Amino acid sequence: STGSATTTPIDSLDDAYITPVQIGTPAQTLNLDFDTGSSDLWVFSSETTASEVDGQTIYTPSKSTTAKLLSGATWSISYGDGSSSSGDVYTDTVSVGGLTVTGQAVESAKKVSSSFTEDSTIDGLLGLAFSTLNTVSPTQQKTFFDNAKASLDSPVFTADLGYHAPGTYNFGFIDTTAYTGSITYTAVSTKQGFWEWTSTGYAVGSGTFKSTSIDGIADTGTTLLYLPATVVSAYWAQVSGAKSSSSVGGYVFPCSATLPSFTFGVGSARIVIPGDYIDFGPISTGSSSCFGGIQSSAGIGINIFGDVALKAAFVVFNGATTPTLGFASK
Numbered sequence: 660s661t662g663s664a665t666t667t668p669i670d671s672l673d674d675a676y677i678t679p680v681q682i683g684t685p686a687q688t689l690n691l692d693f694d695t696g697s698s699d700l701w702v703f704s705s706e707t708t709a710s711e712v713d714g715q716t717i718y719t720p721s722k723s724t725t726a727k728l729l730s731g732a733t734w735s736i737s738y739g740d741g742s743s744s745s746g747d748v749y750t751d752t753v754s755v756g757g758l759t760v761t762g763q764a765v766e767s768a769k770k771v772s773s774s775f776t777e778d779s780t781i782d783g784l785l786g787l788a789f790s791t792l793n794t795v796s797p798t799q800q801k802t803f804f805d806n807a808k809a810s811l812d813s814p815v816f817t818a819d820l821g822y823h824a825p826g827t828y829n830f831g832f833i834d835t836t837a838y839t840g841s842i843t844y845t846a847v848s849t850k851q852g853f854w855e856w857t858s859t860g861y862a863v864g865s866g867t868f869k870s871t872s873i874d875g876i877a878d879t880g881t882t883l884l885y886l887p888a889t890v891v892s893a894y895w896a897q898v899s900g901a902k903s904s905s906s907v908g909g910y911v912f913p914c915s916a917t918l919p920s921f922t923f924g925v926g927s928a929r930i931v932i933p934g935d936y937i938d939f940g941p942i943s944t945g946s947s948s949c950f951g952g953i954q955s956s957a958g959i960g961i962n963i964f965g966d967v968a969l970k971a972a973f974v975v976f977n978g979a980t981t982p983t984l985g986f987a988s989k
């Protein structure tokens with residue numbers, strides 16, 4: 660079997676993408692953020708403290724005839740930006756784009772950090788990293804992808820994110836009309852639980868390609884592109900007036916400048932990120948300083964190929980027993 664669902668940016672800066680997901684019987688439709696950097700499926704629910712809920716659609720297990728409390732199980736998660744949430748655990752039926760998994764662990768948020776409460780448009784997260792990072796205790800739980808793998812025509816899903824436009828997550832098949840040229844596959848390390856791979860280098864604008872190994876993770880749940888300080892400095896050096904701002908927390912640039920493109924290497928292939936994708940707009944309303952989409956990973960400890968990079972490509976997450984990542988131009 661297969662599944663296919665449209666994913667939509669939540670705002671005009673592509674800060675995140677939401678995808679409708681059906682949970683329970685009869686279906687309750689929630690808009691979840693598909694996150695290949697985590698491995699929990701957690702939702703706002705009828706159990707979330709009412710003051711921590713501001714416009715989200717909530718999952719109500721009591722109205723689902725297929726929901727079962729997973730007696731004794733809890734979860735607690737903390738994200739790389741300081742967000743967190745925790746609660747108890749149900750199993751229920753979960754469908755994405757026609758693809759149905761029964762007995763999926765649905766982690767019900769009792770508490771959410773303030774950054775989720777202020778994001779009215781995101782009802783929860785659907786983790787698509789490897790199940791070894793799932794936070795359910797005492798019995799670790801499998802991700803939606805892991806649960807669906809048996810029944811999929813092919814153990815893959817693909818991410819086709821749009822620039823200021825809707826895109827597609829496909830499960831179980833590769834749409835050969837969604838990309839141009841060939842798909843270049845590259846090896847994945849699963850040792851930290853992430854879709855971790857090694858980029859073969861980079862180029863700034865029309866400069867020469869610098870061959871150098873950049874290890875990092877493919878993360879649909881992260882907005883920006885976080886790269887080593889040396890790479891990020893060489894990019895922003897080509898933008899007149901760009902500077903790193905401690906008060907803002909990263910590189911900013913005069914909104915009137917035109918940004919060079921950024922190329923990253925996949926094996927021998929090259930993926931070009933248009934300069935327009937790197938503009939994340941004024942730091943505050945009316946400001947003439949704009950926030951850059953390429954920032955340093957020095958403070959994070961891992962390089963992250965977030966949405967800025969992934970939306971320039973058609974991306975194949977191959978969950979074969981030896982996993983790989985595929986990139987194609989589109």
Ligand SMILES: NCc1ccc(C(F)(F)F)cc1
Nearest residue numbers: 696697738739878880881961
């Ligand atoms: N999108 C999930 C996520 C968030 C943070 C991190 C970090 F910061 F730990 F690398 C990894 C994955």
